[PDB]
Design a binder for this molecule. Structure first.
Ligand code: HEM
Ligand code: HEM
Ligand SMILES: C[C@H](O)[C@H](O)[C@H]1CNc2nc(N)[nH]c(=O)c2N1
Ligand SMILES: C[C@H](O)[C@H](O)[C@H]1CNc2nc(N)[nH]c(=O)c2N1
Ligand SMILES: NCCN[C@@H]1CNC[C@@H]1Cc1cccc(N)n1
Ligand SMILES: NCCN[C@@H]1CNC[C@@H]1Cc1cccc(N)n1
Ligand SMILES: [Zn+2]
Lengths: 407, 411
């Protein structure tokens, strides 16, 4: 019942009682752990709303108050009559902040309470979505001094009028399969870069073409829009020593902004809820740049450094990796764009965990995702035991729209 | 039931059916995952079923399931259990058992080598002095002048729980740790408590930074006894860097034989409490953990200084830079002295081939992702991108309480 987690580097032990409120399943059983798998009605709704409202009222120290009771009945009546309900602005803000607070795979949750929420529940068209999104991008980019934000479009009704942002992230580079059998640009977006053409986009066929938003409103077919170039802050990457680095012709966008998840608050589902914060260096330097199935640039950087790539044990990949990540952090920092390194981010998360353990009784966390993709054990989270479990409000995964949309 | 795992770097998907033979618990539930938690005398009653499951696997393995040989053996063991409350394994069954505990060790990345294991049968051993001799022979054989060979030595199984054989050392070869009155530590901080037990037991500590600890051996439930491993038998490697001539002056060196001695080997319900095993090192065990963990040798700073990196702010990634160099130094030193060692790229690439092979020929390969991915350069090794299923199969290697916490001293 009362579990404990120990940090093997500092011997600190914390007791976990928050998991006892867990609702959703984990995919694991007492017989098999699936910790490393990426993706493991009115009657149904009122209980969910109640769970939510109770925690909301408790958070504002009015648990059991008349207001609490009053609200509880009002929603109940609305569900019984409308088969759904609308959240109060306050409940919306609280819900969004808590879905972030509950995101077990996010290392930057110490920032959870500082989130700007844009209520786009009055939106009705794709052009309106485009308008709300540009405003979001501009707000969060803030000339390089990034601010976390989320824009929340209308909740699901009958499933046949869902709002969706077809892009996986608001800002990403296109990818095209060339005759050479090779891939141009970002390989992960090949299929998306094509659906933009299948729709009309005029691909400049470059190695870093900011893709076009493909917005779907109220259920209709998605429409294209080109984010005002002046709104997309990008950073050219140079090394603070290797002058040849720039010649690689590398750059990355400054706004990390996930747009394909589903936000669940009190039983309600928000299928279009783009959110953004600021980067941790490794996401770009290690994953976007060095992943084999991504820009896969290790060999090139290695050759440029004249390293013995004959034998794996000279660790040329490792040496290069470090430089490629020193570069990213260097550039961003030079151009004054917010960014955090894995050492600082993980240290933060540990502080946050301790706070969450003493003020909430726990902090759900997925070790597989929390530990950086490079230098694992020299970051504190590596030695930190973590308990993973699901709490609502939450951000959930949902099917790519192009595999569900009936045109 | 069928389960699938996917590799996100190659899109390759695999199907697991082996998990259906999993019996032990994982620590997880449908409500909480304990995937990153380090540590989540039998009765006749519970023993024959364990014996039967094991003998069925053995007899199937040799394609003699249901044979007369198979049925007689089951009848033999059954009778032995009702009669003596336990039973003895044939030599062939012990070997098969040991090899399989390694094959089922989901936290082991070097399992492609599982069928090549030299098993030393020390079940006729009765005293600590006898244990020492057995252990010396294992160290000499395994080391093989630098051309390492995997091996395991198996001492008498548990009986009433009051006569256990135990190797008090966590690893056969490790360096002493000494807490100074100023609060600093000389040597390996992880072995400070064990070193104190050794000193208290009579060990004359040379108090340096790399003193090979003495073996503390317990036979038949009696009080443990100290022994010094013949120095000539302890292979060591001086650590130097291929380009940094000052690295050698850091005064670092490491032993060549990695060898776990505190685990419990379970085969057919029987418990082998003293079962030291050894293989050869993956560079990062020494380069990343033993040297760079903050609670171990912690050499990141001193190495950093010498290289004159910008240590003012973490974003220079000075820690990461000194980490690669040190790991380069460990691999180089071992290769130069012709002592077997494998880097993390090579080891993980092999594990992936091993794993696929295992799904095809066995229907699975239980693996613990948290332990399989190297402690540095995680995502540039193929295992990072590999989904894994973790479940427990027997025969297996299990944790057991440290003996100083359970032993009834006799004086
Ligand atoms: C302000 C700085 C922030 C930092 C430094 C940060 C960092 C991280 C990192 C490193 C990841 C893993 C990315 C990957 O490997 O794909 C992540 C994932 C995630 N973050 Fe944060 N984050 C921040 C802000 C946000 C915000 C504003 C929200 C929510 C409103 C959020 C929600 C999540 C979720 C749900 C995931 C997992 C997404 C998935 O499963 O693919 N993050 N975060
Ligand atoms: C051939 C060389 C081998 C290599 C390269 C290899 C490598 C490794 C490494 C990197 C670890 C993780 C160590 C740690 O972080 O503490 C490990 C764990 C393990 N290995 Fe292997 N191994 C090899 C041979 C063996 C042998 C021969 C056995 C058994 C007969 C074995 C049994 C295990 C077990 C049980 C674990 C988990 C230990 C624990 O839970 O503390 N390994 N191995
Ligand atoms: C198979 C495995 O779960 C997968 O490669 C995970 C590992 N850890 C990760 N961690 C983070 N932060 N992001 C990822 O995409 C992944 N991928
Ligand atoms: C808390 C966490 O489980 C712990 O630090 C684990 C992580 N992965 C590991 N992996 C290996 N190989 N060895 C270890 O000791 C650990 N420690
Ligand atoms: N959802 C899987 C893809 N996630 C991508 C991987 N890099 C940016 C984004 C994560 C993310 C979201 C918010 C902030 C941040 N630093 N990182
Ligand atoms: N069992 C906890 C400590 N394990 C230590 C960590 N480094 C050597 C040994 C593992 C081990 C056993 C066998 C072979 C190998 N390469 N590594
Ligand atoms: Zn689990």
């Amino acid at each position: 019942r009362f579990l404990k987690v120990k940090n093997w580097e500092t011997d600190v032990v914390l007791t976990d009682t928050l998991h006892l409120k867990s609702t959703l399943e984990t995919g694991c059983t007492e017989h098999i752990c699936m910790g490393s798998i990426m993706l493991p009605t009115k009657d149904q709704l009122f209980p969910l709303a109640k769970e939510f409202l109770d925690q909301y009222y408790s958070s504002i120290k009015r648990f059991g108050s008349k207001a609490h009771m009053d609200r509880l009945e009002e929603v109940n009546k609305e569900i019984e009559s409308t088969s759904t309900y609308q959240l109060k602005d306050t409940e919306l803000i609280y819900g969004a902040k808590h879905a972030w607070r509950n995101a077990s795979r996010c290392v930057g949750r110490i920032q959870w309470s500082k989130l700007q929420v844009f209520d786009a529940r009055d939106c009705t068209t794709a052009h309106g979505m485009f308008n709300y999104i540009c405003n979001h991008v501009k707000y969060a980019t803030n000339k390089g001094n990034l601010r976390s934000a989320i824009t929340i479009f209308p909740q699901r009704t009958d499933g046949k009028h869902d709002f969706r942002v077809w892009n996986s992230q608001l800002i990403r580079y296109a990818g095209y399969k060339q005759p050479d059998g090779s891939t141009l640009g970002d390989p992960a977006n090949v299929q998306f870069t094509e659906i933009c053409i299948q729709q009309g986009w005029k691909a400049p066929r470059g190695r870093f073409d900011v893709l076009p938003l493909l917005l779907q409103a109220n259920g209709n077919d998605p429409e294209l829009f080109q984010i005002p170039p002046e709104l997309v802050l990008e950073v050219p990457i140079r090394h603070p020593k290797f002058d040849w680095f720039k010649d690689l012709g590398l750059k990355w966008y400054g706004l990390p902004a996930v747009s394909n998840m589903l936000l669940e608050i009190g039983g309600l589902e928000f299928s279009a809820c783009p959110f953004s914060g600021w980067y941790m260096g490794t996401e770009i330097g290690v994953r976007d740049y060095c992943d084999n199935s991504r820009y896969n640039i290790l060999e090139e950087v290695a050759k440029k450094m004249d390293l013995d790539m004959r034998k794996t044990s000279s660790l040329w990949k490792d040496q290069a990796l470090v430089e490629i990540n020193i570069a990213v952090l260097y550039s961003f920092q030079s151009d004054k764009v917010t960014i955090v390194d894995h050492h600082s981010a993980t240290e933060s998360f540990i502080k946050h965990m301790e706070n969450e353990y003493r003020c909430r009784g726990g902090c759900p966390a997925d070790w597989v995702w929390i530990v950086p993709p490079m230098s694992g054990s020299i970051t504190p989270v590596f030695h930190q035991e973590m308990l993973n479990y699901r709490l609502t409000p939450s951000f959930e995964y949902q099917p790519d729209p192009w595999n569900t949309h009936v045109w």
